[PDB]
Amino acid sequence: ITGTSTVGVGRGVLGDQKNINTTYSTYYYLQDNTRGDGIFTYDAKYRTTLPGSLWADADNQFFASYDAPAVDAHYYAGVTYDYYKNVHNRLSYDGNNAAIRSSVHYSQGYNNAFWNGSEMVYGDGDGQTFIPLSGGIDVVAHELTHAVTDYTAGLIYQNESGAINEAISDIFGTLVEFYANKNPDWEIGEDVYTPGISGDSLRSMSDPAKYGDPDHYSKRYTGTQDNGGVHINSGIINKAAYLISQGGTHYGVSVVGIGRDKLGKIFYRALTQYLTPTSNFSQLRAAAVQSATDLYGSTSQEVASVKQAFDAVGVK
Ligand SMILES: NC(=O)[C@H](Cc1ccccc1)C[N+](=O)[O-]
Numbered sequence: 121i122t123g124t125s126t127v128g129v130g131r132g133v134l135g136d137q138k139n140i141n142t143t144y145s146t147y148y149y150l151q152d153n154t155r156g157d158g159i160f161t162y163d164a165k166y167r168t169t170l171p172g173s174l175w176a177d178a179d180n181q182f183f184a185s186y187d188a189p190a191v192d193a194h195y196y197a198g199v200t201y202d203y204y205k206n207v208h209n210r211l212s213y214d215g216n217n218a219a220i221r222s223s224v225h226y227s228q229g230y231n232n233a234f235w236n237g238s239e240m241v242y243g244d245g246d247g248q249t250f251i252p253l254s255g256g257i258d259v260v261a262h263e264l265t266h267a268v269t270d271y272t273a274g275l276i277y278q279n280e281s282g283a284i285n286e287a288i289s290d291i292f293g294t295l296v297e298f299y300a301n302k303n304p305d306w307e308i309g310e311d312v313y314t315p316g317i318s319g320d321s322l323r324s325m326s327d328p329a330k331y332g333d334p335d336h337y338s339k340r341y342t343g344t345q346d347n348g349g350v351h352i353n354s355g356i357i358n359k360a361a362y363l364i365s366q367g368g369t370h371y372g373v374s375v376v377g378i379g380r381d382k383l384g385k386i387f388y389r390a391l392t393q394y395l396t397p398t399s400n401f402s403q404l405r406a407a408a409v410q411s412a413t414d415l416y417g418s419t420s421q422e423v424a425s426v427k428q429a430f431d432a433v434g435v436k
């Protein structure tokens with residue numbers, strides 16, 4: 121809507137206080153005019169009709185429990201926007217400052233979040249398996265990253281191309297989490313997953329097998345469930361990315377780590393200049409090797425590490 125940019129204050133899902141960019145016009149709306157063509161957060165009101173209504177607030181204070189999911193969805197979308205802009209010189213997900221829209225309070229007890237091709241959608245969780253999912257910065261960045269992928273590589277969401285699609289979202293969701301630098305780690309969704317259990321997560325990049333996901337090509341899922349295992353086989357790529365960045369010896373193969381920043385540079389380049397809708401794991405290895413080559417040279421440690429990483433997970 122048309123109005124004047126203001127700054128509200130509230131509390132996120134984890135009870136943390138933060139300032140959020142709003143817009144005043146009779147009501148204070150969750151509309152951030154400071155980033156690109158704006159970041160808009162809507163209320164789904166426990167239903168499934170999207171996007172719902174632009175979040176309206178009477179006094180610009182967002183401390184109600186009902187407000188929490190909206191506060192985080194709005195704030196973290198901003199952090200993710202900043203990541204892509206400041207780190208990769210990318211303006212919003214389409215590269216041309218497209219408006220970023222999110223809807224919270226989607227359905228009832230909905231234990232998931234997703235990008236529907238046009239916007240972000242967050243369930244509140246059932247309070248047992250999940251709490252409002254927008255509370256996890258890695259979850260928010262993961263979902264927004266799907267928008268980036270859809271506008272760039274366009275990886276088909278099934279089988280190996282789908283597994284890469286998932287991994288790219290886990291990778292950048294994690295890199296964004298490290299960017300915000302608040303309790304960063306290589307796990308996925310630990311901040312909003314099972315409030316009753318300590319130290320677990322939905323997925324692990326450092327050790328996919330911890331939650332039953334493959335950490336080597338020889339253990340890939342070939343069934344039809346989960347669109348051919350996109351959330352399962354993603355572990356193979358997640359492990360490789362973890363190794364490229366942190367290094368280590370996996371199944372007897374040693375990898376020299378090069379750090380998170382270079383991991384991000386290599387994968388961002390592969391995603392935006394080499395990967396295609398039908399790219400498979402072997403093709404991802406080639407894209408990453410070529411990306412590292414462009415960025416650091418064919419004889420660089422970076423290129424050697426990318427090769428070791430994929431060798432370690434059995435991807436040739
Ligand atoms: N099915 C899920 O739980 C996934 C949603 C999710 C993704 C990242 C973190 C937490 C939840 C599907 N996905 O990755 O789009």
Ligand SMILES: [Ca+2]
Pocket residue numbers: 177178179180181182183
């Ligand atoms: Ca209020």
Ligand SMILES: [Ca+2]
Pocket residue numbers: 297302303304305310311
């Ligand atoms: Ca964390």
Ligand SMILES: [Ca+2]
Pocket residue numbers: 258294297304305306307308309310
């Ligand atoms: Ca995490």
Ligand SMILES: [Ca+2]
Pocket residue numbers: 310313314315316317318319320321
């Ligand atoms: Ca937990």
Ligand SMILES: [Zn+2]
Pocket residue numbers: 262263266286289
């Ligand atoms: Zn995903």
